[PDB]
Amino acid sequence: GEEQMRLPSADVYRFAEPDSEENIIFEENMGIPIIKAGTVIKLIERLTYHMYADPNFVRTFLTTYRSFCKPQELLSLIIERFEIPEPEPTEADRIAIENGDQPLSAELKRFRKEYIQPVQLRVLNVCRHWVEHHFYDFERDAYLLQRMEEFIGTVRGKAMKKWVESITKIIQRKKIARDNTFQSSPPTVEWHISRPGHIETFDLLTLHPIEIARQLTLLESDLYRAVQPSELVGSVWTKEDKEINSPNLLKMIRHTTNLTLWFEKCIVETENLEERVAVVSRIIEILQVFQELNNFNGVLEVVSAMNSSPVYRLDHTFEQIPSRQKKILEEAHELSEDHYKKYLAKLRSINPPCVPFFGIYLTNILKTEEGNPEVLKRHGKELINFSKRRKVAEITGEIQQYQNQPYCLRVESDIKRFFENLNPMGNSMEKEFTDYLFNKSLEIEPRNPKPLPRFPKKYSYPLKSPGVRPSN
Numbered sequence: 001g002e003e004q005m006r007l008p009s010a011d012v013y014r015f016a017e018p019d020s021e022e023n024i025i026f027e028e029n030m031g032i033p034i035i036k037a038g039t040v041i042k043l044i045e046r047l048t049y050h051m052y053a054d055p056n057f058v059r060t061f062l063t064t065y066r067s068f069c070k071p072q073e074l075l076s077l078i079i080e081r082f083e084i085p086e087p088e089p090t091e092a093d094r095i096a097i098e099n100g101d102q103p104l105s106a107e108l109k110r111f112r113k114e115y116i117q118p119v120q121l122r123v124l125n126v127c128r129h130w131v132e133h134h135f136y137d138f139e140r141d142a143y144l145l146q147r148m149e150e151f152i153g154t155v156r157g158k159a160m161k162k163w164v165e166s167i168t169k170i171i172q173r174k175k176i177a178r179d180n181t182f183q184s185s186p187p188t189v190e191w192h193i194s195r196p197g198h199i200e201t202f203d204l205l206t207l208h209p210i211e212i213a214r215q216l217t218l219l220e221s222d223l224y225r226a227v228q229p230s231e232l233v234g235s236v237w238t239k240e241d242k243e244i245n246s247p248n249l250l251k252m253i254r255h256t257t258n259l260t261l262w263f264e265k266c267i268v269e270t271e272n273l274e275e276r277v278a279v280v281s282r283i284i285e286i287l288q289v290f291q292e293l294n295n296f297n298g299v300l301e302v303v304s305a306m307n308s309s310p311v312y313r314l315d316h317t318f319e320q321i322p323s324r325q326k327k328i329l330e331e332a333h334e335l336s337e338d339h340y341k342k343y344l345a346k347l348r349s350i351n352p353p354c355v356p357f358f359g360i361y362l363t364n365i366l367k368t369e370e371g372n373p374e375v376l377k378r379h380g381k382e383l384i385n386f387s388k389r390r391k392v393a394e395i396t397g398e399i400q401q402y403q404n405q406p407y408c409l410r411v412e413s414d415i416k417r418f419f420e421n422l423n424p425m426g427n428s429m430e431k432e433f434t435d436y437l438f439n440k441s442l443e444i445e446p447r448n449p450k451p452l453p454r455f456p457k458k459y460s461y462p463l464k465s466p467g468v469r470p471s472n
């Protein structure tokens, strides 16, 4: 047809081949069509489509492309997309040109205005979005940035120079940011037995339970806000380049692991029954203050430690926990039942700030990664399943909704360092450390036929909690 013949030939340009069932497919539409799957060449063509802007596809593609295309490869493909060949002059214009006259160039001017200029501006819009929302690709790869800067720095014409200046302004702002707010005063920092600065005495029962929950919420809020969506795409936190591709996500997971295991260690290593009741009761009070602060991540870290194999079996310890605290713990656990039905209602109704439970996002993303194929086959050809990536991107979009909710709480540097440097395992691996905790659990409360032994006290300081009500 006429529309296809005016486009460049396949022997001079790869992004102009006709659409077909074996190179691009779409979801049901009733409006910009939604791409279900396509080859990388068709995804690049639609990423920089001449007929209309597509901000949803650009956003989803730049968040998830690392699962099917390398950053260097994507830059080469969008640069290749930008370099469009122009049609040859018509016979009449060829005669005008050889006589030294100005050609009419009717179709040539139309191709430049309706195809070349829109595609080139779309390529530049992709570059701008890439540097604005995913500058980490350029921080990790200095050669990728040198290539980008050379490309934008050699684009000609005043119409595109304004776009180039906007891209450069972002790149420079990002480089400057690598180098170098409250309405009310935050509440008073709470202290119990440990005095400010006496970091040697810092522990679960010597620090104030209110301040443990506040500082852990500040720590977890910062860790939550730092996770970038691409760190969660294609299960990259479970593959070889995990440390480079998912640094903030792995830091969130390791804090959750270390805090949960630290709570369990505090419990099972407290061999005296009465002292262990005080330890468990103090962790429940920490959960209460996490609930007050809408730190659902912290509430469910306490629930995980209490449900763990070594702690959950301590019938004699929970027997002495007051009914009110046991009820608080049971309702916190019921937040997780029925696929987190009650947690989702609580999260939707609460007033910010909050720290959402991060584990549910990992669970849902892994379900989507394992449950959907990487590619779709149509007529014996493989197409990248883009709808799978879009489903993951929508879960990461929910994460981003709660990443702009700072707390009006004062940081206590020593308490912050104490929780950032938790190392319950020491030199042990996780599996061997959990086997240790379970054997310690069997020692302090042996299985039913065997009687319950007495153990000596380990804490010199008083065990009475100062409560969860502030002081002033």
Ligand SMILES: COc1cc2nc(C)nc(N[C@H](C)c3ccccc3)c2cc1OC
Pocket (backbone or CB within 6 Å): 303, 306, 307, 308, 312, 318, 326, 329, 330, 331, 332, 333, 334
């Ligand atoms: C069927 O399994 C369970 C059901 C559970 N129901 C409730 C209501 N609370 C659980 N734990 C919470 C944190 C708890 C409360 C009081 C004392 C100790 C622990 C459960 C744990 C389970 O397994 C580990």
